[PDB]
Every structure is written in structure tokens, then in C-alpha cells.
């Protein structure tokens, strides 16, 4: 016989290997596939799909539909943001339950940009202006309008256009960031403030809500396949 030599690694079973084994049912007519709409090629594609963020996970509002309703109430112009959010995926309970986050809990790194879209859900007649602000990684949470004003911010007008889209760029030290809580690689903050205030005509309800969405971009990628499934 052809002189062959068995090297180390024979008779072992690598779960992640890729070998050609015997086919149990020879000549079996496999039913041909049809173009059923919605074929998926890669997971990153499901991320580029905007998904509503449950912002208000308060004691009573969490695990209820109210977690998705950010309400602009009738309170004083205090530079206390209406909402603030940490750009730290699994290291923050809010970005975690999004389809975006659901993809990130299966990897170790994440790169690229992300986009937060705010949709106003108030009376047509109602008008006002708000300031959506972004504070790059490592920087302290912008707690005042003036503070938040200095950095990357969009001045979103309610009166004119109903939906704001703020694309958070790639201002990161490491070429690949931690999906985990790390100070070496920590997200940043996305917060909203009252640029102006809310103006409502006649006797139209003085309290409406805003929804939030999050998704990935074409440059968004992931690595090192891991898991977390319990019993």
C-alpha cells in the first residue's frame, strides 16, 4: 500500500472542523429552493434595520410598552437633559435590548458608526426646537445645555421636520472596541435638551411623546463568535 504516516490529531473530534463525510441517503431528490422574499446573507444586515429603543426602563415603565415612550412634560427650563444615553452597548441596559445589541451580545468587538433617529409624535400645530447632543468617548456626561452645546450636536426643529437622524461617528482609540464594560474603551453620551421649549396652540394636550431608533451602518462589523445561553 501507498506509504502513509498517521500524524498527531488523528481520531480526535474538532467541533469547528470542516470535513466531507458519507451521505446517508444516496440519490435523494432534494426539493428545489424557491425565491421566498427576504433572504439573509449576513447578520450585520439585521443591524442596519432601525429598531426602537426602550428608553424609559423605570421601575414601573420597564417590561411594559411605556419603556418606549419618552414624554416631554411641562417642567422648567433646567439644563437637565430630557434624556441621556450611554454609547456603551452591553455596558448599558438600554442599548442592549435593541436588535442592534442582540447582534452584539454574540461577539467580542464592534466597529463602525451607528445612527439614532428620533421621531416626534405630537400635534401638527405644536412647535418647538430641541438640541440632540453627542459627547465622544471618555468625556464627562453633558449635564447643561451650554456644556452639550460645545460638542457635536444637531438642533432639531419640531415645527418643521418630524424626524431627526444623528449618525454617531467612529471616534475610537482601538480599531476594535469592547462590547463589555471597560474604561480603556467606554462609549460616550447622546443627550437631548430644550433648545427652545414646547409651544402648543389652543387647548391641545400639553404632553406628547418621542420614539427612538437605532441601527448600524455599512462600515459596522463584528468578531470572535461567542455565546450566552442559560437553562
Amino acid at each position: 500500500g501507498l506509504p502513509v504516516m498517521n500524524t498527531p490529531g488523528s481520531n480526535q473530534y474538532l467541533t469547528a472542523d470542516n470535513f466531507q463525510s458519507p451521505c446517508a441517503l444516496p440519490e435523494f431528490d432534494v426539493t428545489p429552493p424557491i425565491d421566498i422574499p427576504g433572504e439573509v446573507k449576513n447578520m450585520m444586515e439585521l443591524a442596519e434595520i432601525d429598531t426602537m429603543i426602550p428608553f424609559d426602563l423605570s421601575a414601573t415603565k420597564k417590561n411594559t410598552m411605556e419603556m418606549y415612550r419618552v414624554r416631554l412634560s411641562d417642567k422648567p427650563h433646567t439644563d437637565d437633559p430630557i434624556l441621556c444615553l450611554s454609547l456603551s452597548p452591553a455596558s448599558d441596559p438600554r442599548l442592549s435590548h435593541t436588535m442592534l445589541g442582540e447582534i452584539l451580545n454574540y461577539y467580542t468587538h464592534w466597529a463602525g458608526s451607528l445612527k439614532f433617529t428620533f421621531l416626534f409624535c405630537g400635534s401638527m400645530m405644536a412647535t418647538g426646537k430641541l438640541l440632540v447632543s453627542y459627547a465622544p468617548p471618555g468625556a464627562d456626561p453633558p449635564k447643561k445645555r451650554k456644556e452639550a452645546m460645545l460638542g457635536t450636536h444637531v438642533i432639531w426643529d419640531i415645527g418643521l421636520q418630524s424626524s431627526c437622524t444623528m449618525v454617531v461617528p467612529w471616534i475610537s482609540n482601538t480599531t476594535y472596541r469592547q462590547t463589555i464594560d471597560d474604561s480603556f474603551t467606554e462609549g460616550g453620551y447622546i443627550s437631548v435638551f430644550y433648545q427652545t421649549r414646547i409651544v402648543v396652540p389652543l387647548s391641545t394636550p400639553r404632553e406628547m411623546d418621542i420614539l427612538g431608533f437605532v441601527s448600524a451602518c455599512n462600515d459596522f462589523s463584528v468578531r470572535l463568535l461567542r455565546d450566552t445561553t442559560h437553562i
Partner: nanobody
Framework: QVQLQESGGGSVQAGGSLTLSCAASGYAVSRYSMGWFRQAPGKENEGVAAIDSSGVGTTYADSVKGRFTISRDNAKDTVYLRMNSLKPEDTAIYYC???????????????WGQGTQVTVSS
């Protein structure tokens, strides 16, 4: 998993001082702030007091201003809400939450306690 154990509740008198506390597990208390939210029977999520562990910069609600005192402990990872001089309006099931930080807003937080019932008995 981050845990906040709302401890210091009960039915005291009108003017009766009652301190509150919360054990902050899962993170370095300095990276976060900490505040308080009360909700009267069948009412809404309303703020009371909150301060940032690093800057220790105070902030109270207008109605509670004066009588309530917030103070943080970086050693025991606990907050102390000295609800002094209580009133029948202060009868609201309290809650504590770690902030990003810093101030009393709609929600603006993430980790929420179970809920301790304080009743300003009169």
C-alpha cells in the same frame, strides 16, 4: 448584574425625619451618580434628589428643596437620603436609581430598585 437595595423605608410622623440608602453592586459607584424618585398612590414618576459621586454637586426638586438631604458614600457604595421634616405630600413609594449622571429628570437613569414604601403618617 447591578443591584440597588432600597433600604430605609417606613411609616413615620409628619415632620418625622427618615433616612434612605441603597447598596450599589456591579459597578464602581464613581462612574455613576445616584438619585431618588417618588410616586404617590396612582400618580406619576416624580423626582426628589440626586448627586454625582465624583463632583458631589447637589440638585433637588423645587417642592422638596430644603427638607431633603442627599449624600453619597464611596466606601460602602451607598447613598443617604435624609428626608427630614416630612409632609403628608411626601407619602409616595420611593425609588433609587444610578445615573449617567446626574440630575432629576423624567427617567434619564437605568438601574432601578424594587421600591420602598414610606408613608408620612399624620
Amino acid at each position: 448584574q447591578v443591584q440597588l437595595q432600597e433600604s430605609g423605608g417606613g411609616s413615620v410622623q409628619a415632620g418625622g425625619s427618615l433616612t434612605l440608602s441603597c447598596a450599589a453592586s456591579g459597578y464602581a459607584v464613581s462612574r455613576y451618580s445616584m438619585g431618588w424618585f417618588r410616586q404617590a398612590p396612582g400618580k406619576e414618576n416624580e423626582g426628589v434628589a440626586a448627586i454625582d459621586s465624583s463632583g458631589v454637586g447637589t440638585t433637588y426638586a423645587d417642592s422638596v428643596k430644603g427638607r431633603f438631604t442627599i449624600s453619597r458614600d464611596n466606601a460602602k457604595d451607598t447613598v443617604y437620603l435624609r428626608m427630614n421634616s416630612l409632609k403628608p405630600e411626601d407619602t409616595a413609594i420611593y425609588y433609587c436609581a444610578s445615573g449617567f449622571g446626574l440630575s432629576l429628570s423624567r427617567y434619564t437613569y437605568a438601574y432601578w430598585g424594587q421600591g420602598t414604601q414610606v408613608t408620612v403618617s399624620s
